[PDB]
Amino acid sequence: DLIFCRKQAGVAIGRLCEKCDGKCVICDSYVRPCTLVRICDECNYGSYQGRCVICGGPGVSDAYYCKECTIQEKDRDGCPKIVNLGSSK
């Protein structure tokens, strides 16, 4: 249904909207935003520039992995922009 992008992340910083403002992209934990999120160039292109990493709304802050994910190096997988396996709209 939903899956991470997991492509090679580049220099594009991932954003978060006002509703999804304080969660880790992976585990939804609100505690200790530790490491900044990078996203691949394709997911950050055109209309998707500055969009949210979780839900895809207008981003108002920066996305962070939690401390637990940084300890487990979950920040060092592919870029974590959630994609629905449905249409491209």
Partner 1 sequence: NLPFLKPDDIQYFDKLLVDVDESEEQKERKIMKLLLKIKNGTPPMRKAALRQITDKAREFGAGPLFNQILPLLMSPTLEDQERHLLVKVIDRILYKLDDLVRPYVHKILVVIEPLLIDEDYYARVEGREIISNLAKAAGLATMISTMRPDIDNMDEYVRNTTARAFAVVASALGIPSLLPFLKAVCKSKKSWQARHTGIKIVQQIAILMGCAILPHLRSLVEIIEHGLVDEQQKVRTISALAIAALAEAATPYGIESFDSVLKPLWKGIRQHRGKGLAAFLKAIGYLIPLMDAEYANYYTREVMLILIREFQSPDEEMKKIVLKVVKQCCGTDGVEANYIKTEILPPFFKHFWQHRMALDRRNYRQLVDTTVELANKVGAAEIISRIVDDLKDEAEQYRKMVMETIEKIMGNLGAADIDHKLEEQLIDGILYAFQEQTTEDSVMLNGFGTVVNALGKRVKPYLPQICGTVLWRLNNKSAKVRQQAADLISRTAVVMKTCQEEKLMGHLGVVLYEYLGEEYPEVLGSILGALKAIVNVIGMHKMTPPIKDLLPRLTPILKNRHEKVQENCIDLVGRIADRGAEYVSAREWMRICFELLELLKAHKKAIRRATVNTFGYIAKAIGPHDVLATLQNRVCTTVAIAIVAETCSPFTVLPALMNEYRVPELNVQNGVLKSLSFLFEYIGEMGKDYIYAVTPLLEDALMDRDLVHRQTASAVVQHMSLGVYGFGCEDSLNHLLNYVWPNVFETSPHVIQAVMGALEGLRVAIGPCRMLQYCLQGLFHPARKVRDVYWKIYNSIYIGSQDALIAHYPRIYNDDKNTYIRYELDYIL
Partner 2 sequence: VDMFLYNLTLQRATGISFAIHGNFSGTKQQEIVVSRGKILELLRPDPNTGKVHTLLTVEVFGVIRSLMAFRLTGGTKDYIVVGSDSGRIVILEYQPSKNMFEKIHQETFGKSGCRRIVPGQFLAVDPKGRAVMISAIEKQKLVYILNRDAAARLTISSPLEAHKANTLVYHVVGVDVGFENPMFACLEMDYEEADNDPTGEAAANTQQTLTFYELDLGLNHVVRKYSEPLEEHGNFLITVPGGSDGPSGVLICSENYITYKNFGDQPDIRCPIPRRRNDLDDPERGMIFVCSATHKTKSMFFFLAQTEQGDIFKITLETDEDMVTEIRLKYFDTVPVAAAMCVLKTGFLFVASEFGNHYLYQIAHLGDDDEEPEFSSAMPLEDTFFFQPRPLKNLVLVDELDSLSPILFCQIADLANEDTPQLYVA
Encoded one letter per residue, x for contact with partner 1 by CB under 8 A and - for no contact, window 29-68 reads: x-xx------------xxxx------------x-----xx
The residue ranges of DSSP E strands in 45-89, in sequence order, are 61-62, 64-66, 82-84
Q: Scanning residues 54 to 73, which ones bind partner 2 (CB under 8 A)?
A: 73
Q: In angstroms, what is the C-alpha Rg of the chain?
A: 12
What end-to-end distance do the CA atoms of the chain give, in Å?
A: 16
Could you list the residues that contact partner 2 (CB under 8 A)?
A: 8-12, 38, 40-41, 73, 75-76
Binding-site residues for Zn(2+), in ranges, read: 5, 17, 20, 24, 27, 40, 43, 52, 55, 66, 69, 79
